[PDB]
Design a binder for this molecule. Structure first.
Ligand SMILES: [Zn+2]
Lengths: 192, 243, 171, 105, 190, 197
């Protein structure tokens, strides 16, 4: 009833679907806050209140799939989160290069949200988007080096991965879990 | 200076659909990644299905109103909301039906064992019980007619535990999973009895890996690859959640 | 698990068995139903049978001689160069069989050596799984040397990387 | 690195290896006494020992990989240690030879 | 002119690091993936080099025998930058070219094509055994044992004529242990 | 030897699992190996007759506590092995049939055994019972790719004339293109009449 490739992991589209439930800041380009001096949003999964009280260019926070729906039309702009600016990503790059073992504390959704917003909101960034793409690429490459170091220390016992992304984890998950399972089964089998 | 933040707190103090959806997301993630069949969220699923029914009726009623101030955009958001939510419920149920397929004989054994701390109607939905019972009968009928008709009565049991290989497939209890340590869901670190201070003055849970006879400190707000049996009661109490 | 096909085939592999009794009728294992198997008959038996005759008999009916796939020759080749080793030629199910053998006789040395073997090969397996086209012959010559167990891990891992790369760069 | 500095450490490490696996010392003396007896009454065996790379790996993996990857720096001190051992046995350069598990080589 | 060579190298480094189509950094990906499977080369489509900055292609096609080693050097530097955490060793990477320049048939190649990049086709009628060419020579003076080195780019070197500070007329010898070599093969195209 | 036919059968099982796994689609599974299964069931009957013959001759009792015990053990283990091989083959093809049921029929027949044909009928009836009782607000057999877009463009790949939907129609003119709610056309993408996304 569940396909083999979905049995013990998430598809990248499911990882996207998870990340799309996160709140994001938008500048509305419609006004829905009816003045004191008609259809309302009436949602059941998320905060209905913000969308019914939008005013144009008063920034407000909504769930990301609604922000993408409004940005498919010209009816909002999505404010790129503070970490995704050039200066912040450069600080994270310096952290990654300065601490060879720790992963830098980017948010768990960083690669997923970078991909989403670089595609669907390429015009909304204050910084030039080619630099943001370049530095997101720098971060992924440096973090992949750190992953390849970490996998030399797989155990039958456990492992710790402090600030690894949801996407990076989900990409590694079948390999790490299967190999550690087999190391366990070798070790436990040897016990009397 | 004199700290007063508690005084200001006692000045400042003067179920929701969003919480249910977040709980569904938690249940879906834990279910997808765990090896065990987790217990069904009975009340949560009941109330979610009621909401999906009433929201469908609402979207329909507004559509009839349009057919009989007008803007369609909130209507589009409601439509795709129900699409996203019904996707999560669909994926969740389909996953645990796959688990029922894998563990059909083990689940039957849990129902057979009068000493089991779990009854099957605690663990499974009513529709999952329908599915488990009748799928088990239909598979049993298939292998009865095709194979087991011809075996000697030493071996016609479909679930022989005494065979040279145990016929009953059970959950891989020590399967490795990724977890993120929440802590208690409320921020009451002083209330949680299992939560305790690590060195470097930060909270954690200590758990024992019994095969290795070894302890590990699961710090809050950090991610570990852990054997599922070791973390299982922390997960049951939501102190960790599976990535 | 019971219905696990790669386990069923692994149980179907053969190991050298020395018999501890004279038993009439079992000569069909020596291809003739009309005669006994004698004590000190040395015979290759399937593991699904050898596993049980190694324990039941008090002296069991069979003793399992050390199989050539775990001989000191193979163990030395394992301990020098794990990624260069052609395990698929040694035995296509060597990890499953090593797990079964480690369980059947508690053998800490073999468990340590097989853990080292799997870990070191897991590094190289991940390298080839992560590499993607925009396939290399170096990958092909390495994949020929993988067990069915490692082939399953590689397929699942490489699919994960490929699917992620697809989602990132495509729509 | 200058090889001559670490040469002494490599000599004593291979001497420890020879002591650890005494069958090589026994083989050295077997060769010597055979040659002595053929000289005693008027065939000669050579001054060569086949050492197992497996024994050397289990003794010192770092020295073993040095033999495989850097033989121009690791064989001459190993043969010097062997020559010193043969000289320590009672009453000319001795050579090494190798067997087993070369892997990628 | 070493500053100019450094700016050529940095230009190629920027080409590897910056060239992108449809949201993918194709040469960063290709170089990383090549490193993972331990083949130290990069296949470059010169349509992309032209599309990036035709000044670079003009420099490349004017004098490839000088420019190709600089491009190889740039690839090594980016390889280290995308596969090693520096402040916590790889060889000289081979450049490989894809092209759709108009083919010159093998008979029409003559003296005006000398040292130009050329695209042609034919039948391989023979393939010689492999042979070892030096990339890095470790070099010693026979008398004073003054040591030096030659780092070689195989696009066309010799031993120095006399000692680089009597010391003999023609004194240098190769230290074959420290010198680095590469495989070379000869083919005949009909 | 009594186990060899089991090895041949589960080698067939391994190959058909790879045949299903390697391709992106649901490949229609190959022919049920009635011949090898008949050989194995005949071998089981031989082993049953051997146990009956031996348990009769245990009244004569030739060294029975060891010799007859050992003979009985070996001929019993042969039957356990052949049961495992048969059930492995049948459980694999059952899993593929269930996967196909969810992927298509809940929305080549010669290759199934007739037990498998009626099994598949019953499992489809079960699926259609699940998406008919409670929980019917969700089509439990729908897609498991998450809904990426609410409106999509779809090109008509085969002609199907004028059909209704809940508040309108589509005229499925060949090589016409719609822009439409995805939830109103998914059934036709699965049935292969519509092309895109
Ligand atoms: Zn000189």
């Amino acid at each position: 009833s569940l396909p083999a490739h979905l049995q013990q992991t998430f598809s990248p589209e499911e990882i996207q679907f998870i990340v799309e439930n996160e709140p994001i800041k938008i500048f509305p380009r419609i006004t829905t806050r009816q003045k004191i001096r008609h259809t309302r949003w009436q949602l059941i999964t998320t905060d209905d209140k913000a969308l019914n009280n939008m005013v144009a260019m008063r920034s407000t926070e909504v769930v990301l799939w609604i922000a993408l729906l409004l940005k498919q039309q010209s009816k909002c702009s999505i404010v790129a989160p503070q970490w995704l600016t050039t200066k912040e990503l450069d600080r994270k790059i310096q952290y990654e290069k300065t601490h060879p073992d720790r992963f830098s504390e980017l948010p768990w959704n960083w690669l997923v949200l970078a991909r989403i917003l670089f595609n669907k909101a390429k015009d909304d960034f204050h910084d030039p988007i080619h630099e943001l793409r370049g530095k997101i690429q720098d971060l992924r490459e440096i973090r992949q080096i750190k992953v390849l170091k970490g996998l030399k220390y797989l155990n039958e016992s456990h492992l710790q991965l402090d600030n690894l992304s949801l996407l990076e984890i989900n990409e590694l998950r079948p390999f790490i879990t299967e190999i550690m399972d087999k190391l366990r089964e070798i070790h436990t089998a040897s016990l009397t | 200076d004199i700290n007063i933040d508690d005084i200001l707190a006692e000045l400042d103090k003067e179920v929701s659909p969003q919480q249910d959806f977040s709980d569904l997301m938690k249940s879906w993630k834990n279910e997808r990644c765990s090896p065990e069949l987790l217990p069904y969220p009975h009340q949560l699923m009941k109330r979610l299905l009621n909401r999906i029914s009433m929201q469908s009726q609402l979207i329909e009623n507004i559509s009839m109103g349009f057919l009989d101030n007008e803007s369609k955009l909130p209507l589009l958001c409601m439509e795709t909301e129900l699409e996203r939510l019904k996707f999560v419920i669909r994926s969740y149920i389909r996953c645990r039906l796959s688990k029922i397929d894998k563990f059909s004989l083990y689940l039957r054994q849990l129902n057979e064992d009068e000493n089991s701390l779990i009854s099957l109607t605690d663990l499974l939905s009513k529709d999952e019980i329908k599915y488990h019972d009748t799928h088990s009968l239909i598979w049993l009928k298939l292998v009865n007619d095709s194979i087991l008709k011809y075996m000697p009565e030493e071996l016609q049991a479909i679930n022989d535990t005494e065979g040279s290989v145990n016929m009953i497939d059970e959950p891989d209890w020590n399967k490795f999973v990724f977890i993120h340590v929440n802590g208690p869901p409320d921020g009451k670190w002083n209330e949680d009895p299992l939560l305790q201070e690590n060195e470097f003055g930060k909270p954690c849970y200590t758990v024992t890996i019994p095969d290795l006879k070894e302890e590990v400190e699961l710090t809050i707000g950090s991610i570990y690859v852990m054997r599922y049996e070791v973390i299982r009661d922390l997960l049951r109490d939501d102190k960790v959640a599976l990535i | 698990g019971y219905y696990d096909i790669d386990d069923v085939l692994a149980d179907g592999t053969e190991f050298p068995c020395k018999f501890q009794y004279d038993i009439p009728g079992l000569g069909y294992l020596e291809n003739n139903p009309g005669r006994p198997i004698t004590k000190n008959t040395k015979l290759n038996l399937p593991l699904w049978l050898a596993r049980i005759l190694a324990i039941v008999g008090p002296v069991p009916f069979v003793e399992l001689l050390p199989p050539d796939m775990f001989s000191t020759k193979v163990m030395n080749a394992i301990k020098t160069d794990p990624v260069a080793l052609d395990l698929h030629s040694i035995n296509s199910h060597f990890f499953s069989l090593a797990i079964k053998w480690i369980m059947l006789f508690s053998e800490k040395e073999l468990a340590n050596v097989v853990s080292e073997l799997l870990l070191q090969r897991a590094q190289e397996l991940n390298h080839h799984a992560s590499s993607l086209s925009i396939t290399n012959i170096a990958t092909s010559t390495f994949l020929l040397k993988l067990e069915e167990m490692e082939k399953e891990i590689y397929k699942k891992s490489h699919e994960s990387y490929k699917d992620t790369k697809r989602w990132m760069f495509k729509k | 690195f200058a090889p001559d500095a670490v040469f002494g450490d490599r000599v004593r490490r291979f001497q420890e290896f020879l002591d650890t696996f005494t069958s090589y010392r026994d083989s050295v003396r077997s060769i010597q006494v055979y040659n002595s007896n053929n000289a005693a009454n008027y065939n000669i065996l050579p001054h060569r020992i086949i050492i197992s790379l497996d024994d050397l790996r289990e003794f010192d993996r770092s020295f073993w990989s040095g033999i495989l990857v850097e033989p121009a720096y690791f064989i001459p001190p190993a043969e010097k240690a062997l020559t010193d051992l043969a000289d320590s046995m009672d009453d000319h350069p001795w050579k090494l030879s190798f067997k087993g598990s070369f892997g990628a080589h | 002119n070493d500053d100019d060579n450094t700016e050529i190298i940095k230009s190629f480094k920027n080409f590897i690091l910056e060239f992108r189509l449809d949201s993918q950094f194709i040469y960063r990906d290709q170089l990383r993936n090549n490193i993972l499977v331990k083949n130290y080369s990069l296949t470059v489509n010169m349509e992309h080099l032209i599309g990036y900055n035709e000044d670079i292609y003009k420099k490349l096609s004017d004098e490839p025998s000088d420019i190709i080693p600089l491009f190889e050097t740039a690839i090594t530097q980016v390889a280290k930058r995308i596969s090693i955490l520096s402040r916590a060793s790889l060889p000289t990477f081979q450049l490989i070219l894809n092209s759709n320049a108009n083919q010159i048939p093998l008979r029409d190649l003559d003296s005006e094509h000398v040292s130009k990049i050329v695209r042609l086709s034919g039948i391989i009628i023979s393939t010689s055994v492999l042979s070892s060419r030096a990339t890095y020579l470790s070099i010693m003076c026979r008398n004073c044992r003054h040591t030096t080195s030659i780092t070689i780019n195989n696009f066309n070197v010799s031993l120095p004529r006399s000692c680089l500070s009597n010391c003999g007329p023609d004194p240098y010898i190769i230290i074959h242990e420290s010198s680095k070599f590469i495989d070379q093969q000869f083919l005949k195209l009909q | 030897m009594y186990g060899d036919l089991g090895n041949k059968l589960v080698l067939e099982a391994k190959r058909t699992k790879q045949l299903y796994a390697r391709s992106n689609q649901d490949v229609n599974l190959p022919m049920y190996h009635e011949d090898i299964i008949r050989n194995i069931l005949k071998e089981v009957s031989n082993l049953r007759k051997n146990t009956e013959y031996l348990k009769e001759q245990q009244q004569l009792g030739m060294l029975d506590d060891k010799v007859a015990k050992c003979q009985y053990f070996v001929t019993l283990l042969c039957m356990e092995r052949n049961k495992r091989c048969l059930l492995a083959y049948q459980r694999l093809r059952t899993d593929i049939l269930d996967s196909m049921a969810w992927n298509n029929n809940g929305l080549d027949t010669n290759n199934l055994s007739h037990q498998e044909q009626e099994y598949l009928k019953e499992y489809c009836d079960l699926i259609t019972d699940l998406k008919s009782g409670d929980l019917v607000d969700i089509d439990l057999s729908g897609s498991l790719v998450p809904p990426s877009d609410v409106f999509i463009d779809v090109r008509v790949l085969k002609d199907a004339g004028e059909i209704q939907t809940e508040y309108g129609v589509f005229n499925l003119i060949k090589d016409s293109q719609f822009f439409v709610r995805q939830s109103d056309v998914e059934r036709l993408i699965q049935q292969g009449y519509l092309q895109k996304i």
